[PDB]
Design a protein around this ligand. Structure first.
Ligand SMILES: Cc1cc2nc3c(=O)[nH]c(=O)nc-3n(C[C@H](O)[C@H](O)[C@H](O)COP(=O)(O)OP(=O)(O)OC[C@H]3O[C@@H](n4cnc5c(N)ncnc54)[C@H](O)[C@@H]3O)c2cc1C
Ligand SMILES: [Br-]
Ligand SMILES: [Br-]
Ligand SMILES: [Br-]
Ligand SMILES: [Br-]
Ligand SMILES: [Ca+2]
Ligand SMILES: [Cl-]
Length: 501
């Protein structure tokens, strides 16, 4: 074998995987059919994704990875155009044929800033990390075939000799060639059925200028300095600025709109569907009076999928290649970074003992498949909560409380790793969590709240129950589990801006 590991895809997933494996002493080859620089979706970081990047950095002693968790460090070390700022999530609710109210808002602020990742710059920088640690990169390639044998993997290339390795990691997202050839991917069983239109734009007005200033909203954060979700019965639209950081130079704003295909199927070109949306929701339209498109729209008719398996003797599919649900709540980067964190030590142990069996990587699969199933429940129930603001307001606390517990758990793991300096103990601690792929990771009390709340939302959809009844039932569930959650006052529904500590 020419190499130890072949990685397909040189996006952030493949690049970071390549970096940690090469740093740890594997001969790595990264293959990509495109070349940098190149646009990619997946821009909103979360408290979880930030901690997971710092864990990867700390676990494998690669300081440059930790830079990617902080907007100031990205500006300083990647480049001033490589991110915008994110001080929280924000949700603004709307209804067709009614004026939009700036009191139909929720926006819980973070403790520390996070990033809106300008992926063309972040992903190239990440590949440079891998290249500096000795990973080889071959761009603009064409994979002819991937053979999986009992003594290794063989990848045939157009106009080049075959390459051989002990293991292949598919980090190629929706274009996973390993997923196509293995027949792993399916949409059977998925509660979520959504499409997406997305692009980058110039001259997108801030929420504050376009709709309502801070003095009106009473938000503790500018919605301009947040991942802003405009939600409504049949779908939602994101406003993710890169031009909201005072030290930043990026002029663009990322815009994407998603529809629940059960409620509305688009019939026309992206720009026409966009205009129809702004007519339906004029308040959303106030962002876009002077705005112009800085790339072509991308349309994806169905963004949701899962897999029945994602590891074998000689392969692993990373999360995007395995499964995706929706941009809502930004679980994609979380699932990805944690999967790398779990996979990489196991691949190192496999390469060091020369043992390559499916059972060695079973916990990577367990985490990934569980994460997609959790995210499917989370998102499908959220799309049902879009029908009414008061319902959304109560429902968002189910997600928030879970995410807050998950982030606290990852912070504690990082804290313990930094103090003990013990890598094996961290790996075991991550694997020992009682609910891998779930929002809290390890809280049985929370996962009871989550499961019961999701059952309430599905029953509400199935039986067309009134929204006031559904909201009240969720309120009582939150109250019932309060003591077991973090002491943030989640049951205080009148407080729409839940603060930390
Ligand atoms: C519309 C949309 C919005 C999203 N929004 C968010 C968000 O706000 N927050 C969040 O956390 N996550 C989001 N996600 C999920 C997020 O996109 C992923 O978690 C993340 O981009 C994964 O990065 P990656 O490096 O695995 O894949 P990518 O960044 O897509 O890179 C994959 C690479 O593989 C290459 N490739 C593809 N096919 C082949 C082939 N056959 N052979 C060789 N190479 C190939 C490509 O050229 C590309 O460079 C979103 C997803 C979608 C679809
Ligand atoms: Br740092
Ligand atoms: Br309310
Ligand atoms: Br209530
Ligand atoms: Br209240
Ligand atoms: Ca070797
Ligand atoms: Cl996502």
């Amino acid at each position: 074998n020419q190499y130890d590991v072949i990685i397909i895809g040189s996006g952030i997933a493949g690049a970071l995987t390549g970096a940690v494996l090469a740093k740890s002493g594997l001969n790595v080859l990264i293959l990509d059919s495109a070349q940098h620089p190149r646009f990619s979706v997946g821009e909103a970081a979360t408290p979880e994704s930030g901690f997971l990047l710092r864990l990867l950095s700390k676990r494998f002693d690669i300081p440059e990875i930790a830079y990617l968790s902080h907007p100031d460090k990205i500006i300083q070390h990647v480049g001033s155009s490589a991110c915008g700022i994110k001080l929280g999530f924000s949700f603004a609710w709307h209804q067709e044929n009614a004026p939009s109210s700036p009191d139909h808002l929720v926006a819980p602020p973070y403790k520390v800033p996070e990033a809106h990742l300008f992926r063309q710059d972040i992903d190239y920088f990440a590949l440079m990390i891998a290249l500096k640690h000795g990973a080889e990169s071959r761009q603009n390639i064409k994979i002819e075939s991937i053979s999986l044998n009992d003594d290794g993997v063989e990848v045939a290339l157009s106009n080049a000799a075959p390459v051989k390795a002990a293991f292949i990691i598919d980090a190629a997202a929706q274009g996973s060639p390993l997923s196509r050839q293995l027949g792993l991917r399916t949409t059977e069983g998925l509660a979520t059925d959504t499409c997406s239109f997305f692009t980058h734009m110039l001259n997108v007005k801030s929420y504050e200028d376009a709709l309502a200033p801070l003095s009106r909203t009473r938000s503790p954060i500018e919605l301009f300095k947040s991942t802003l979700h405009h939600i409504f019965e049949e779908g939602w639209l994101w406003v993710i600025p890169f031009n909201n950081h005072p030290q930043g130079t990026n002029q663009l704003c990322s815009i994407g709109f998603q529809f629940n295909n059960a409620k509305y199927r688009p019939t026309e070109a992206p720009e026409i569907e966009f205009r129809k949306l702004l007519k339906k929701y004029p308040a959303i339209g106030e962002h876009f009076k002077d705005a112009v498109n800085a790339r072509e729209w991308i349309y994806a008719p169905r963004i949701n999928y899962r897999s029945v398996q994602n590891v074998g003797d000689r392969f692993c599919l990373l999360p995007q290649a395995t499964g995706f649900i929706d941009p809502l709540f930004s679980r994609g980067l979380i699932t990805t970074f944690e999967s790398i964190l779990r996979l990489a030590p196991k691949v190192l142990d496999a390469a060091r003992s020369n043992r390559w069996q499916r059972e060695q990587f079973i916990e990577v699969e367990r985490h990934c498949l569980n994460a997609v199933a959790t995210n499917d429940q989370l998102v499908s129930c959220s799309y049902e909560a879009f029908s009414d603001f008061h319902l959304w307001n109560v429902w968002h606390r189910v997600w928030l409380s879970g995410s807050n517990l998950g982030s606290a758990f990852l912070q504690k793991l990082l804290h313990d790793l930094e103090h003990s300096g013990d890598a094996r103990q961290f790996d075991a601690a991550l694997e020992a969590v009682r609910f891998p792929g779930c929002l809290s990771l390890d809280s049985p009390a929370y996962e009871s709240l989550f499961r019961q709340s999701c059952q309430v939302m599905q029953q509400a959809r199935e039986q067309a129950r009134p929204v006031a009844e559904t909201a009240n039932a969720l309120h009582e569930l939150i109250k019932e589990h309060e003591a077991e959650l973090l002491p943030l006052g989640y049951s205080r529904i009148s407080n729409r801006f839940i603060l930390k500590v």
